[PDB]
Design a protein around this ligand. Sequence first.
Ligand SMILES: Nc1ncnc2c1ncn2[C@@H]1O[C@H](COP(=O)(O)O)[C@@H](O)[C@H]1O
Ligand SMILES: Nc1ncnc2c1ncn2[C@@H]1O[C@H](COP(=O)(O)O)[C@@H](O)[C@H]1O
Lengths: 145, 153
Amino acid sequence: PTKVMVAVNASTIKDYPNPSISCKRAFEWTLEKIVRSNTSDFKILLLHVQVSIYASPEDFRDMGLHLLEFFVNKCHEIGVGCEAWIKTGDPKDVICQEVKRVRPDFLVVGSRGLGTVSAFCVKHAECPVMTIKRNADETPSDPAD
Amino acid sequence: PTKVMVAVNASTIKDYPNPSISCKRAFEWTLEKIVRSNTSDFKILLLHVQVSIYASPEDFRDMRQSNKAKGLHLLEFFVNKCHEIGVGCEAWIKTGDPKDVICQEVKRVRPDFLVVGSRGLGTVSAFCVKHAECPVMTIKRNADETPSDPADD
Ligand SMILES: Nc1ncnc2c1ncn2[C@@H]1O[C@H](COP(=O)(O)O)[C@@H](O)[C@H]1O
Ligand SMILES: Nc1ncnc2c1ncn2[C@@H]1O[C@H](COP(=O)(O)O)[C@@H](O)[C@H]1O
């Protein structure tokens, strides 16, 4: 079973807990075009890298995981096996550290196509890397978003 | 069926008409890890980018070693590889600057993704990842087939 690591992160423009447009597209494309209906031939490894006094009812209302849950649901829905977890530190380094630890067959990263993370992975990950850029119609006017 | 474009080129260290170590690794890896036994779920699109008076027998040997011929022999190697395991394929040659042409071909043919080998030098693979208008899979060579000078392919 081909182990596909998918680096997933939060959106900075879409409200929380939405995944970034880039990693969502990358994830969905991978399921559409790579996994297809062959759901037992692949295993998705979802990695997200992450960087008390109460005085009124209001303070209780005010009071990474929900991201992972979005993708785990997507996998469950079409029946692909997955494992999802969080590690801490600099995302591009940690992704690479996790590639050498987990040894997935390849790494999927979205990319905003700005020329940080996706470029470093391609350069340094110790497995093949699939870089997926956003569709034109879902690319924000400012590509950095 | 997922259209997989695979950019293939000739080796400069291996005698002709051998594929480069990197694109060979790239192709074989894709068959092994992506296509697997599901040979009808994928279609391989093999692209090679290529960069008359005869006076002596030697001129005919040269012709047979031209880029055109280096090109076709290259395509035939991969088409045989596809046919052997029963994966549908299409293979052709375009002319010009390889990185530019690969990208032009991506937008013309519209494959679901592009597979390129990579020597891991930090020319072609990095340009594709940056510019191709489809997903790009970059596959580097195994340690044990990487020549002492990584520029060699
Ligand atoms: N904090 C993170 N944790 C896991 N993956 C990340 C993280 N940040 C970025 N990525 C990956 O990098 C992609 C964006 O790459 P880039 O545009 O080069 O920053 C996202 O689609 C993710 O695949
Ligand atoms: N003439 C060419 N035609 C098609 N693909 C090429 C050509 N030259 C290089 N490539 C692709 O670029 C890869 C090498 O990438 P790089 O080491 O980054 O130059 C090869 O493995 C091929 O996948």
